[PDB]
Design a protein around this ligand. Structure first.
Ligand SMILES: O=C(O)CCC(=O)C(=O)O
Ligand SMILES: [Cl-]
Ligand SMILES: [Cl-]
Ligand SMILES: [Fe+2]
Length: 277
């Protein structure tokens, strides 16, 4: 297979620092890039959670999360889920982290939320959207008011599926921590392997970002991606930012010189992407 050549960025004093302005433009136009993991941020507990959560109460300290199914939350989409592909997941929105996750996992989630916030604001500035529209345009993610899922993934190599079939993420921005081969992206109609680099996150955009920016100078895309069939197990985890969803408003497209036009609801966007994706 092809291997994607990705731009690398780091968080600095003025948001995202790519190598130069040209690289930033390639990165945002491709819809995927690498983000250097801050040296102070500890990912070891998250890594361990992704390796354990599916294993049940015999396995300490995280296997017990296997038992918190969807029926424990009111929200069908949270807790432990076996998927149709090799993937199984544990997903939790931020309003539940403090009560439900281990304290050190909630900490990791909070750090990733603030890191994702900085990345998103750097992207919004590059899109030419006026700053006073950012909070509504981002469904709260330009501050700390969005919906945030910290989601743990395990690929059951004993299952005869693709690892995770082709899809685009919901939401605005995904910060993905992966340390093993498997992720593939359809950059320019060709499937390419994402090179492994455990010192970087993989960052891409979701469908809400694509809708938002479709009329800008450089429309941004929610990149189609998948995880190939795994012959041996694999795990990963990701931080996913989407619009606030308190039972108000919904999903916007930015029109240069005019402001924000509502396209649909927060609800209808996720439930509709759940199927054909
Ligand atoms: O596990 C991976 O590398 C990708 C996971 C992913 O694409 C997702 O959870 O939406
Ligand atoms: Cl299982
Ligand atoms: Cl399966
Ligand atoms: Fe994804």
């Amino acid at each position: 297979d092809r291997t994607a050549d990705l731009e690398r960025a780091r968080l600095g004093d003025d948001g995202l620092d790519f190598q130069d302005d040209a690289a930033q433009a390639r990165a945002f136009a491709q819809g995927v890039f690498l983000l250097e993991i801050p040296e102070w941020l500890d990912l070891s507990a998250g890594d361990r959670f992704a390796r354990q959560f599916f294993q049940g109460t015999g396995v300490e300290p995280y296997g017990k999360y296997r038992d918190l199914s969807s029926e424990h939350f009111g929200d069908e989409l949270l807790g432990y889920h076996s998927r149709v592909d090799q993937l199984e997941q544990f997903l939790l929105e931020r309003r539940f982290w403090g009560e439900v996750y281990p304290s050190e996992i909630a900490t990791l989630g909070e750090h990733l939320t603030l890191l994702s916030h900085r990345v998103l604001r750097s992207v919004l500035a590059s899109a030419g959207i006026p700053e006073e529209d950012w909070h509504r345009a981002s469904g709260g993610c330009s501050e700390t008011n969005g919906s945030y899922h910290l989601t743990f993934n395990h690929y059951r190599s004993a299952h005869q599926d693709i690892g995770l079939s082709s899809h685009k993420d919901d939401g605005f921005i995904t910060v993905l921590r992966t340390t093993a081969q498997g992720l593939e992206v359809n950059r320019d109609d060709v499937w390419e392997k994402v090179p492994v680099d455990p010192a970087c996150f993989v960052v891409n955009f979701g469908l809400s970002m694509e809708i938002l920016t479709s009329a800008c100078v450089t429309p941004l895309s929610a990149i189609m991606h998948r995880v190939s069939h795994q012959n041996f197990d694999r795990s990963s985890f990701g931080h996913f930012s989407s619009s606030r969803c308190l039972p108000d408003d919904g999903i916007y497209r930015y029109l240069p010189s005019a402001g924000l036009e509502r396209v649909c609801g927060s609800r209808e966007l996720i439930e509709e992407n759940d199927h054909e994706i």
